[PDB]
Amino acid sequence: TVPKLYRSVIEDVINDVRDIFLDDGVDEQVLMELKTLWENKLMGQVEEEPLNSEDDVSDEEGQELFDTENVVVCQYDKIHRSKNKWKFHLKDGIMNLNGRDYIFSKAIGDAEW
Template sequence: MASSANSNPVPKLYKSVIEDVINEVRELFLDEGVDEQVLLELKTTIAYKQSYDLVSDGQGTRLQDSH
């Protein structure tokens, strides 16, 4: 049986959605004078939050970080 990390497509899907959204709004942010560093920080924050708050156990339930 494959490990749950390999069989769970959710983290890969989240990463793909985050990348797509960041790429789609990049020009809008730049046109409005928002520094690209803001997008990088947003992406990092979302990835961090996903890794701690939205950890899936492979059965569609969400687990919270105990910290």
């Protein structure tokens, strides 16, 4: 059902940029090669600075730069919070979860930190 959606996307994109290819005078073979390659790819001190008396209150830089975990790109409708309790109302939505790709139009949501 969803690979079909990507196929839908392939048809829409190829169709709509075809005219761009023609406008440049680029060959339709290049368009097909693009599609085929793309498909193949698809699968004092204490009054100044007692500040050093709190050294190491730090955490892992591990969780952002590496991106070892999975990623989700979407949109938000409204975000809401109550102390350490957070609520999310999200919309639109492409997910990538341990090997597979998923999709949503709306997603609602609660998390604590």
